[PDB]
Design a protein around this ligand. Structure first.
Ligand code: CHL
Ligand code: CLA
Ligand code: CLA
Ligand code: CLA
Ligand code: CLA
Ligand code: CLA
Ligand code: CLA
Ligand code: CLA
Ligand SMILES: CCCCCCCCCCCCCCCCCCCC(=O)O[C@H](COC(=O)CCCCCCCCCCCCCC)COP(=O)(O)OCCN
Ligand SMILES: CC1=C(C/C=C(\C)CCC[C@H](C)CCC[C@H](C)CCCC(C)C)C(=O)c2ccccc2C1=O
Ligand code: SF4
Ligand code: SF4
Ligand code: SF4
Lengths: 145, 156, 222, 80, 143, 41, 65, 321, 146
């Protein structure tokens, strides 16, 4: 008898490798969990929705932080039609010398990745101009997360 | 009839073959540190780790990313081998915590009876001592393989 | 965990009953939850604190006598080459720390060389251990402050004290380049006892143990 | 292990117990059928869920039903 | 049957060579199964996990890893030589369990001595919906 | 700095943080999960 | 005599707690040394930079960046 | 039958070993090409795996008429020869040079054949009985399953082992004929000139068959440009055959991924529809059997793949060669 | 995939200026294939030639990566559990009856993936491979020229 499927006592009695896969797969199937009522199920879903909200806000805060750190948002503001957006810098130790040289796009120094997520146009449209404001947005979104 | 099962019983799987019934193979396997029941787990761990950490330095030095750099290929290969040795030591400790949280109830039942009460390797603290011997042997063998590339009459 | 606590109104950790001295209930992450682990961490704390005490009093002595800066002292000229100096340092420490570890195995005391405990004067008392622990932790924090003021200010402790006495309103940490970092950090540290109090208030009967990879307190959770 | 249930639609053809190579099913006397027999499953924990009894069942719908779930070392057909 | 028989370790075993299909470590840490039959002459039968073996004239003993192997051998023997065998279950601690002929007359017969178990007097498809048994821990077919 | 107070990370931070979450954090994840799965009651 | 040196080698790290702590400390120390000091001394081709390479992109015109 | 587990286990081990040290080399070369490090490749310019045994056999067979077969006028073939025969200005047969890429592809072939023979021999050996199902002999040769018991015994019959073996032989022979076509078009077939000999493709097999992306771009994309541009010409039927083969290959995956219960229920709905206005057939419509569905899927898959390769090969070799 | 093929090809022909090429080439499927999956894939597969490497080397690697994951999805989708159980049983016998490795023993018994699990993992591998290869091709064909 194991204890990894704490939600499913029958799954913990499984002595095979199927227990791991089924416990991972039936992780948020609260309606089939052992000894669980309706009210606790609803409260668990409420907490899970809060968790997904926190994850979403953390992810967009990270997008703001990485754009403000390693992007070319000021250069994109000065010239949107010419300068390409930059998502995040590339630090891969398995990269070769030509590989570093082939990813310094957008007028950057190190290896960077060109952003095609559309956040540069969106943030230029809503009045965000400097990376200071993107940094403040990132820390505020981390705070609300 | 050379081909026969061990101890004259057919209900088992593994059967006695001239690959296994050769006296050279049997005495080589019995004298290996992993099958030396009368020795402490840390000593056989030291021998096993020494052998494996000595062999692991080879491919990292010879085929490493900096193999064309003279004087730094051996250092990088040996420290990567030591890191791999540490990874295997972590694996050994995790296996000792995992497989020995319970207690065995039966012996090994060696040939012609005369079984030892319990193998100290198959315990929790025994396997922890085995992992300690393994990592000590691993870094010592890696360090020996480094200095064997420092003094040399041939190649490396 | 002692009536005096790390913040006033705190609850002791379940393993921190206060049997060992120097207890103040300060175990947020609960690093040591095993008595063998707890006593090894106490011995390691005493070792690092004693070295911090020796290093700090050497720092004040060297700054008082006028010797040059400590972080630049490694590049200064010295008799005996650093190679054989390092070699004899490991040569003597492979015996000193060996005797220390063997004495800790057989007795548990912090003796020196063949003398366990190395107390020829004989002021062995629990209050002496408590005073040593407090002064040691203060020297730990003092060495961290010395390293910080060597890094960002580039001046010794005596020069830092003179700059604090000359203009304390502006020649502080909070007006430096690591200023607002320290402001946010100390604001988080001020908020920190209230979040712990809120966890205790809402969690009236729950364990609420901090489950972390460094401890097996999560085994009782599930 | 799995759950094996026999409903009253069974007519006692005693062929569901022949198709099961695990001795899960058994035939008990009954009075609700012409053959005066009914399938029963005393050794239900030995079942693997191979549904050979459902294949052998002639009634529509099936008198003997096997429900999967809660696998064990005997329900998974493991010799190791 | 009339009296429950206990297996005898003194019965011989059929002549067979080494087969890789057979007992494993599960026979040590967990239970294993032993099949016993009485033969009038030396015949050749196929093992459920190996090749072909010659049974002995008289009692026989076969150790198999699973109950399915034992019942496959039992069905093969009953179809071929009308042997009517029986198999046991030997646990890791030495406990011996009697499995196949609990009444001694096989599951095909009734013997008027066994009770009904896991039988529903309702028709299949008359079970309640899962909404009616939600958050109860009981399946509709378990009622 | 001119309002670098929403703290700008150093230009050498990737060299420490990329292997930290590529090599150490996966190692802690495997070790913690493997201790979780092989836990008997 | 040979066994004693390795016995005292293991006795300080015999516990699985001690060896887990040792491998964790060495792993984080080595990873923190790598990149910060491990790179730029082996001349790893991630911390060097370009000479003057790959500023323009787009072979079908437009010539961004 | 007695030691079948040992045979299957050793065959599985050597299959996995061959797969790793035949395909991870390709993936590694793909990575170091994508990492901008061609000097770390498993290629001739970088560190190499020279097929010394094949080259030694070639040299022995070239020198075989000199000593071991003195009555032969020349070598038994021009694979290992030294002369380039040419008829009508086109190279009939010229010596074949074996390098690192040839070593990689030959060991990939060995891996693929070892896996296919593993599947077929496991199907043959475990057809009678197995540790999972001891009574597999009484279930016949071609049966779909023994039910979802023991975790699910689908495709446990020897027929389904052969059903997978058809796909694995398809993969093996497809890689074999791809190797043949690329090697001939890059190192044998071509037009002879007064200044040297020019092949169909400019020797791209030596420098492009070390990576999967190189294989793709320089064989399936560098060629097949005449199949797509065959419209309005004599080879347009080859393009039609190509796209119809794409259709039949893609249509097979319906019969392969799906099962029978969903299709039986859909057929039940269609039977209701035909019942509403009384066009119900007297023969009850039923879905294809599980073995029947597997057979249809593998047959349509093989037909689509074979006709795809047939159309591509023939259009490329007629529009160019 | 159909809606994104339509969007990408129509917009690519709009941006390049030859809307007539899409108008006269989207009628027949061979024109669709030749002028979308072949013409626009020229810059994608030239990410890392043996001659050299460019910025689209990551997109070609992602393209082949999605192909490989889709192929592993086929591996999980075509073959079904029941043959893998016997193969795993043979591997179990191999591990249990070998020197220097029977000392290390599993705590969780190796068991082949369940049929529902098989469908899930085949669908998962299929979908991530599909998404990655199409994203790589789309961004490489739209970034190679503009
Ligand atoms: C034991 C702890 C210990 C600590 C905290 C320090 C502290 C320091 N050492 Mg000293 N050392 C230590 C080990 C030892 N060092 C030396 C001898 C040196 C040398 C050779 C040098 C340092 C210097 C330095 C500084 C490194 C800066 C540098 O080189 O940037 C680049 C600083 C971090 C360096 C320094 O002063 O640079 C400013 C320097 O040149 N260390 C020896 C040999 C006796 C040590 C033995 O314990
Ligand atoms: C969750 C969104 C997210 C994602 C996917 C990334 C992705 C990346 N970051 Mg970034 N990062 C983020 C948020 C994110 N970041 C935030 C919010 C911060 C500010 C605290 C940073 C600060 C940061 C630094 C300083 C560096 C990176 C770096 C990197 C790269 C290497 C991966 C790495 O080391 O992780 C980043 C590792 C960290 C420890 C920093 C993140 C701290 C997290 C967000 C807080 C913990 C939250 C939660 C408990 C755990 C998150 C998991 C959740 C998503 C399930 C990669 C492009 C490195 C790089 O090379 O830059 C390209 C680098 O040096 N990141
Ligand atoms: C995303 C995280 C990540 C990171 C940061 C790295 C980082 C690295 N990998 Mg990669 N790798 C990764 C994921 C990652 N890997 C994955 C997921 C795979 C599988 C697909 C690989 C597969 C892979 C291969 C196949 C190889 C690498 C190699 C390398 C190294 C590049 C060459 C180099 O610097 O020489 C290494 C230089 C070093 C300084 C590192 C050695 C330091 C080690 C970690 C330990 C040294 C301390 C040692 C224990 C001594 C202490 C003793 C103690 C008593 C104090 C570098 C350390 C190469 C390598 O290992 O080179 C030898 C190599 O051949 N990697
Ligand atoms: C780095 C050396 C070090 C070590 C090994 C310890 C160890 C210990 N301290 Mg101590 N402590 C230290 C430095 C250290 N401390 C410093 C510098 C301060 C001043 C800020 C304190 C202030 C302090 C208080 C107020 C209390 C403790 C207590 C404890 C014990 C339980 C807490 C625990 O598990 O932490 C283990 C800590 C470590 C293993 C080191 C930290 C790991 C790294 C640095 C994290 C990054 C344990 C014996 C409690 C006690 O006495 O319980 C009986 C207690 O009440 N400590
Ligand atoms: C004034 C600060 C101070 C105080 C009150 C203590 C207090 C103590 N130490 Mg300590 N000691 C200190 C600093 C201090 N230590 C420093 C900085 C060092 C390093 C040079 C030592 C080296 C030391 C040794 C070698 C030993 C003690 C021992 C002791 C005990 C009695 C001896 C005594 O009081 O002196 C007591 C626990 C003894 C002991 O084991 O007690 C438990 C012992 O053997 N101390
Ligand atoms: C208990 C030890 C201690 C003491 C006596 C001092 C005292 C001093 N430090 Mg220092 N410092 C400390 C710890 C300490 N600090 C620590 C732990 C750090 C972080 C590693 C720093 C970092 C630091 C910097 C970067 C600077 C100073 C400066 C100063 C001076 C201005 C006052 C100030 O800002 O306080 C420091 C503020 C703190 C919040 C630290 C207090 C920490 C202790 C443990 C709390 C309890 C204090 C106690 C009640 C008295 C003053 C001489 C400045 C200077 O040179 O003079 C103008 C300066 O630039 N310190
Ligand atoms: C870098 C890791 C490391 C660390 C932290 C230590 C630390 C220690 N070891 Mg150790 N040791 C190391 C590497 C290390 N050693 C190596 C590479 C070897 C060679 C295989 C040994 C062989 C060894 C033996 C045989 C013994 C020690 C002992 C000791 C202790 C006294 C120091 C001594 O005599 O050194 C040496 C101390 C706990 C001794 C001890 O614990 O005494 C009770 C002891 O018996 N060690
Ligand atoms: C191209 C598609 C594809 C691929 C790659 C696989 C892969 C596999 N199948 Mg499968 N197969 C497929 C389609 C595919 N299948 C389809 C569609 C069917 C249906 C007919 C089958 C039918 C089938 C049968 C019937 C059998 C297999 C077997 C195998 C295995 C062969 C092991 C080997 O030698 O290769 C080596 C391994 C690989 C190629 C996997 C990729 C490894 C790459 C090179 C990366 C290397 C490791 C990497 C560095 C680690 C990354 C770490 C990271 C997580 C951090 C392997 C797991 C056989 C088996 O079980 O083993 C022999 C077997 O008997 N398959
Ligand atoms: C290059 C080479 C790379 C090598 C690998 C680098 C990373 C290694 C990370 C460590 C992996 C192992 C630690 C996790 C599992 C530990 C086992 C566990 O949960 O046990 C509890 C915690 O263990 C312990 O008490 C020991 C924990 C080990 C040290 C701490 C590891 C986490 C550090 C996280 C750093 C993040 C930055 C014990 O609990 P107990 O005390 O009740 O049990 C009494 C017995 N010990
Ligand atoms: C599609 C499908 C079906 C449904 C397919 C069926 C019932 C077979 C249909 C065969 C048709 C009727 C053959 C004739 C086709 C056309 C009518 C021919 C037209 C010819 C023109 C000249 C008009 C299954 O039954 C099935 C079973 C198991 C696994 C997968 C599947 C599966 O994928
Ligand atoms: S197969 Fe069905 S109908 Fe027939 S005897 Fe068994 S339960 Fe009754
Ligand atoms: S599913 Fe199979 S083992 Fe279970 S009762 Fe039915 S026929 Fe017997
Ligand atoms: S999914 Fe089909 S082949 Fe697999 S066990 Fe079920 S009925 Fe048999």
């Amino acid at each position: 008898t194991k204890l990894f499927p704490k939600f499913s006592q029958g799954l913990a009695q499984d002595p095979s490798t199927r227990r791991i896969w089924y416990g991972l797969a039936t992780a948020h199937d609260f309606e089939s969990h052992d000894g669980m009522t309706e009210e606790n199920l609803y409260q668990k879903i409420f907490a899970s929705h809060f968790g997904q909200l926190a994850i979403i806000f953390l992810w967009t805060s990270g997008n703001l932080f990485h754009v403000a750190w390693q992007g070319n948002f000021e250069q994109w503001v000065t010239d949107p039609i010419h300068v390409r957006p930059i998502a995040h810098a590339i630090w891969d130790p398995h990269f070769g010398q030509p590989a570093v040289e082939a990813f310094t796009r957008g007028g950057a120094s190190g290896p960077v990745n060109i952003a095609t997520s559309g956040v540069y146009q969106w943030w230029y449209t809503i009045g965000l101009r400097s990376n200071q404001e993107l940094y403040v947005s990132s820390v505020f979104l981390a705070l609300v997360s | 009839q050379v081909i026969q099962p061990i101890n004259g019983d057919p209900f088992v799987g593994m059967l006695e073959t001239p690959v296994t019934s050769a006296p050279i193979v049997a005495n080589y396997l019995s004298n290996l540190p992993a099958y030396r029941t009368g020795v402490a787990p840390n000593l056989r761990g030291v021998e096993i780790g020494l052998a494996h950490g000595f062999l692991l330095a080879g491919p990292f030095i010879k085929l490493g990313p900096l193999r064309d750099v003279p004087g730094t290929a051996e250092v990088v290969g040996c420290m990567s081998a030591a890191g791999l040795v540490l990874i295997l030591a972590l694996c050994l400790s995790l296996y000792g915590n995992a497989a020995f949280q319970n207690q065995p109830s039966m012996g090994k039942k060696t040939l012609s009876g005369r079984p030892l009460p319990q193998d100290p390797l198959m315990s929790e603290e025994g396997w922890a001592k085995f992992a300690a011997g393994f990592t000590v042997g691993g870094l010592s063998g890696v360090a020996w393989a480094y200095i064997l590339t420092q003094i040399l009459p041939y190649y490396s | 965990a002692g009536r005096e606590m790390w913040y006033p109104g705190a609850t002791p950790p379940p393993h921190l009953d206060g049997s060992m001295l120097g207890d103040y209930g300060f175990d947020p992450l609960r690093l040591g939850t095993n008595p063998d682990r707890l006593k090894w961490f106490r011995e390691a704390e005493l070792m690092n604190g004693r070295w911090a005490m020796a290093a700090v009093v050497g720092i004040l002595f060297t700054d008082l006598v006028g010797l040059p800066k400590w972080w630049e002292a490694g590049a200064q000229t010295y008799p005996i080459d650093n190679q054989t100096l390092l070699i004899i340092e490991i040569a003597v420490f492979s015996f000193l720390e060996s005797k220390r570890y063997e004495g800790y195995k057989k007795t548990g005391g912090t003796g020196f060389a063949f003398f366990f405990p190395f107390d020829p004067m004989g002021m062995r008392s629990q209050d002496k251990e408590l005073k040593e622990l407090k002064n040691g932790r203060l020297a730990m924090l003092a060495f961290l402050g010395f390293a910080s003021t060597a890094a960002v200010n580039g001046q010794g402790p005596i020069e830092s004290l003179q700059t604090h006495l000359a203009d304390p309103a502006h020649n502080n940490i909070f007006t430096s380049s690591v200023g607002k970092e320290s402001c946010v950090f100390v604001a988080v540290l001020s908020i920190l006892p209230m979040l712990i109090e809120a966890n205790k208030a809402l969690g009236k009967g729950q364990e609420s143990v901090p489950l972390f990879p460094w401890n097996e307190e999560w085994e009782k959770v599930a | 292990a799995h759950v094996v249930k026999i409903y009253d639609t069974c007519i006692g053809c005693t062929q569901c117990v022949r198709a099961c190579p695990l001795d899960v099913l058994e035939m008990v006397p009954w009075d609700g059928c012409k053959a005066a027999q009914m399938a029963s499953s005393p050794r239900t924990e030995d079942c693997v869920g191979c549904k050979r009894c459902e294949t052998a069942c002639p009634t529509d719908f099936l008198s003997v039903r096997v429900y999967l779930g809660n696998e064990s070392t005997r329900s998974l057909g493991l010799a190791y | 049957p009339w009296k429950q028989p206990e297996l005898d370790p003194d019965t011989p075993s059929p002549i067979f060579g080494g087969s890789t299909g057979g007992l494993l470590r599960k026979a040590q840490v967990e239970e294993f199964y032993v099949t016993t039959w009485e033969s009038p002459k030396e015949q050749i039968f196929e093992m459920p996990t190996g090749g072909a073996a010659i049974m002995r004239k008289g009692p026989n003993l076969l150790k198999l890893a699973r109950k399915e192997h034992c019942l496959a051998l039992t069905t093969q023997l009953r179809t071929k030589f009308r042997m009517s065998p029986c198999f046991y279950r030997v646990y890791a601690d030495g406990k011996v369990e009697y499995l196949h002929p609990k009444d001694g007359v096989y599951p095909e017969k009734v013997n008027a001595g066994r009770v009904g178990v896991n039988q529903n007097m309702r028709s299949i498809g008359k079970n309640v919906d899962p909404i009616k048994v939600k958050f109860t821990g009981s399946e509709p077919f378990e009622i | 700095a001119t309002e670098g107070y929403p703290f700008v990370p150093p230009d050498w931070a990737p060299a420490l943080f990329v292997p930290l979450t590529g090599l150490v954090l996966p190692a802690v994840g495997m070790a913690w999960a493997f201790t979780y799965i092989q836990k008997e009651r | 005599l040979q066994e004693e040196f390795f016995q005292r080698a293991t006795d300080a790290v015999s516990r699985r707690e001690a060896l887990n702590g040792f491998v964790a400390l060495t792993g984080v120390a080595s990873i923190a040394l790598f990149g910060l000091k491990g790179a730029s001394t082996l001349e790893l081709p991630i911390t060097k930079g370009p000479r003057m390479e790959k500023t323009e992109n787009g072979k079908g015109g437009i010539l961004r960046s | 039958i007695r030691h079948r587990d040992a045979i299957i286990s050793h065959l599985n081990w050597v299959s996995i070993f061959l797969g790793f040290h035949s395909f991870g080399l390709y993936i590694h070369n793909d990575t170091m090409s994508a990492l901008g490090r061609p000097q770390d490749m498993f290629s001739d310019t970088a560190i190499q795996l020279q097929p010394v045994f094949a080259q030694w056999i070639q040299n022995t067979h070239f020198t075989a008429p000199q000593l071991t077969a003195p009555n032969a006028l020349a070598a038994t073939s021009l694979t290992w020869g030294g002369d380039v025969v040419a008829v009508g200005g086109k190279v009939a047969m010229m010596p074949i040079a074996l390098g690192t890429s040839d070593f990689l592809v030959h060991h990939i072939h060995a891996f693929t054949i070892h896996v296919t023979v593993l599947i077929l021999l496991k199907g043959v050996l475990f057809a009678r009985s197995s540790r999972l199902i001891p009574d597999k002999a009484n279930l016949g040769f071609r049966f779909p399953c023994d039910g979802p018991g023991r975790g699910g015994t689908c495709q446990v019959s020897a027929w389904d082992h052969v059903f997978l073996g058809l796909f694995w032989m398809y993969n093996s022979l497809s890689i074999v004929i791809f190797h043949f076509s690329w090697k001939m078009q890059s190192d044998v077939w071509g037009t002879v000139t007064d200044s040297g000999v020019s092949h169909i493709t400019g020797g791209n097999f030596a420098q492009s068959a070390n990576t999967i992306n190189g294989w793709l771009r320089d064989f399936l994309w560098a060629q097949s440009s005449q199949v797509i541009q065959s419209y309005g010409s004599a080879l347009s039927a080859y393009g039609l055959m190509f796209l119809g083969a794409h259709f039949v290959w893609a249509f097979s995956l319906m019969f392969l991924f799906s099962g029978r219960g969903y299709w039986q229920e859909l057929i039940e709905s269609i039977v209701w529809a035909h019942n509403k206005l009384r066009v119900a057939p007297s023969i009850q419509p039923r879905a294809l059997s599980i073995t029947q569905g597997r057979a249809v899927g593998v047959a349509h898959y093989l037909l689509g793949g074979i006709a795809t390769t047939w159309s591509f090969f023939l259009a490329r070799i007629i529009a160019v060669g | 995939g159909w809606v994104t093929f339509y969007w990408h090809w129509k917009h690519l022909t709009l941006w390049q200026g030859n809307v007539s090429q899409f108008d006269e080439s989207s009628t027949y499927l061979m024109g669709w294939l030749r002028d979308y999956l072949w013409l626009n894939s020229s810059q994608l597969i030239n990410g890392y030639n043996p001659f050299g490497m460019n910025s689209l080397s990551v997109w070609a690697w992602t393209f082949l990566f999605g192909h490989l994951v889709y192929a592993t999805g086929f591996m999980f989708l075509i073959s079904w559990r029941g043959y893998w159980q016997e193969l795993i049983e043979t591997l179990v016998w191999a591990h249990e009856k070998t020197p220097l490795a029977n000392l290390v023993y599993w705590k969780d018994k190796p068991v082949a993936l369940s049929i529902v699990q098989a469908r899930l993992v085949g669908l998962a591998h299929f979908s991530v491979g599909y998404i990655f290869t199409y994203a790589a091709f789309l961004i490489a064909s739209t970034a190679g020229r503009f």
